[PDB]
Write a protein that binds this ligand. Structure first.
Ligand code: ZN
Ligand code: ZN
Length: 242
């Protein structure tokens, strides 16, 4: 039997202000949304695993897209609070390399950073990628498609929102099956109702959602969305875990 993840921690990593048309492509632009930024910490048998690394420190007190980030929201300060130094981490998982998911990746210079090849290669070329998110000499562990990280921790390839976006399917000891969509769906309605949202390839984003729905049919997991203001406040967050 595969081990489950001992603890899954949801960690607030600051916020990001966007036009409301980013959670619903049909909306008349002109209203602001203040979205939560997340990272996740997985305690496993072989060691702690961090999923995403917050915003780049150039966003600290430095707000189309307006980062709302304090010093406390820097990944190493998050790491201090959880009780680890970067080198304690078994793996870093980058769901993708957008600035609000990979901006702290430079803090981890020894830990393998799991990233999809299509994401990594896009970040080497596409304009939307900040250098903080694609530093050249980190220990990248480049994968393609679905991948088991450690027993209990699986990566589901869900491109569309970005060229190589990936989501997480986790089994925890306390909660059983958990799906973290990350940016494969910002909100429940992006997923449930297939309300269109911001992305590199919306058509591919839809098929990724359709694939996740096949997984949900079979596994019936609890699902946590990437930037969901409605779901946010009833999540148990660090120091609590699920
Ligand atoms: Zn994104
Ligand atoms: Zn995001």
């Amino acid at each position: 039997m595969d081990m489950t993840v001992k603890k899954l921690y949801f960690i607030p990593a600051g916020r990001c202000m966007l036009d409301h048309s980013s959670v619903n492509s049909a909306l008349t632009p002109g209203k602001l949304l203040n979205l939560p930024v997340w990272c996740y910490l997985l305690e496993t048998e072989e060691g702690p695993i961090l999923v995403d690394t917050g915003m780049p420190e150039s966003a600290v007190n430095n707000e189309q897209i307006l980062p709302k980030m304090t010093e406390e929201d820097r990944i190493v300060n998050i790491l201090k609070r959880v009780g680890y130094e970067p080198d304690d981490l078994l793996y870093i998982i980058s769901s993708h390399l957008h600035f609000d998911h990979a901006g702290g990746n430079g803090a981890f210079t020894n830990t393998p950073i799991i990233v999809q090849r299509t994401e990594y290669e896009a970040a080497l070329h596409r304009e939307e990628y900040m250098k903080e998110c694609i530093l050249p000499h980190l220990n990248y562990k480049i994968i393609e498609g679905d991948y088991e990280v450690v027993p209990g921790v699986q990566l589901l390839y869900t491109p569309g929102h970005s060229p190589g976006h990936q989501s997480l399917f986790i089994k925890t000891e306390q909660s059983g099956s958990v799906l973290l969509t990350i940016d494969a769906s910002y909100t429940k309605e992006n997923f449930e109702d297939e309300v269109p949202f911001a992305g590199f390839d919306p058509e591919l984003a839809l098929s990724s959602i359709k694939r996740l729905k096949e997984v949900v049919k079979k596994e019936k997991p609890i699902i946590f969305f990437g930037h969901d203001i409605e779901q946010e406040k009833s999540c148990r967050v660090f120091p609590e875990y699920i």
